[PDB]
Give the backbone structure.
Amino acid sequence: AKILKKEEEKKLERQKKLAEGTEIGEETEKDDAALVIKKYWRGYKSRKLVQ
Amino acid sequence: MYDPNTSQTEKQKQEEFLKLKIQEAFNLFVKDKKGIVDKREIPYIMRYLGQFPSEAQVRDAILPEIEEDEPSEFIKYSKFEPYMLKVLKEREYEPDDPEALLAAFKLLDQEGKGYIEIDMMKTFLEKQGIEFREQETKSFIEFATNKDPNATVIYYEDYISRLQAFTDKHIESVMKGYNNFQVKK
Amino acid sequence: MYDPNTSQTEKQKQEEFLKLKIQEAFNLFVKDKKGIVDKREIPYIMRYLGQFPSEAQVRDAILPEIEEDEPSEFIKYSKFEPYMLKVLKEREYEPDDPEALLAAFKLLDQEGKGYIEIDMMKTFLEKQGIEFREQETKSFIEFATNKDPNATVIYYEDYISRLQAFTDKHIESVMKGYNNFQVKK
């Protein structure tokens, strides 16, 4: 029930934000996610090789 | 690593520790002639020391800032110490928080099923941002799947948790020694 | 949770934090008008306040006390917060000692083999005492067997350990912020 209440609150907040005509780039989000994942994977490889 | 909210003595000791860790990593990654290391492992040394600079960032702001005016086929401790000393002091190449990885994985999983197809993740890795090699993608699939050969999807949450724990352990390993070094009389 | 042998300032701080937590739980169960919650949700809220009252106990004692002069299908926050505060301070419906649960399970396991059959547990829960509903038994079987579809028996020790760990994590999460919470003047 608390999770559904939080979901409703977040849905209301997102609807209010969209009512302001805010455009969020979606192509760059995937690139940022890939870059972060690659950095973390390379760091994990370095650490595993270190141990 | 470096705390800029400490005393002058603390800042100096942190800098000297950065210098000595740079020296340790360089010596452990010197092959034949003491005082020289290939630039390929320079990001490898940084990862050994916790820094997470991107390949483009490493090539554009790391190597030129440490390479000589005359192109030197390998880098020596001279430009290797102060560079990442200042980087750690300013935390130039600190990786994002784990929430960044969580958001990245959620974005890659548009449907939010809790896992991402191996084919899709490999497509992102080899076609978006800094592309990985085939063997790198194989290793990523192996680890994210817990070395599962027949796995088709990966639970990004468990992988993120394991990566965070391993990063914390390696950070404990590296930081151990971050502390003492004192001005010699 | 609530410490009944702390300082007077600590006593007031704990009482205020418990009142705020009860108000938050009430709001979570508020659907139409603030200050009124469904009667059926009365025991459920107690389970976040650390109380695991039985259905008979709530029906015989909790309901008549919370109910006003006349029987009402909705419980007002005015009669809910004080009763909840006193119940939590007295720890009336706190879950029993995990050792008690282990003893009960071993009593169920006559041979002491460390496991109980799913059918045996279903029969015990549906024929003796306050019989569970179908969904109650389904959830208990699923989560005791760590959501294993091929599980044939339930090991009571590890299931009890997991349930206790989950309860402790939930209690700490619900208690989160007590250190930063301060008495309102």
Notes: The first helix of chain C runs from residue 8 to 28. The longest strand of chain C covers residues 36-38. The interface with chain A takes residues 28-29 of chain C (CB under 8 Å). DSSP finds eight helices and four strands in chain C.
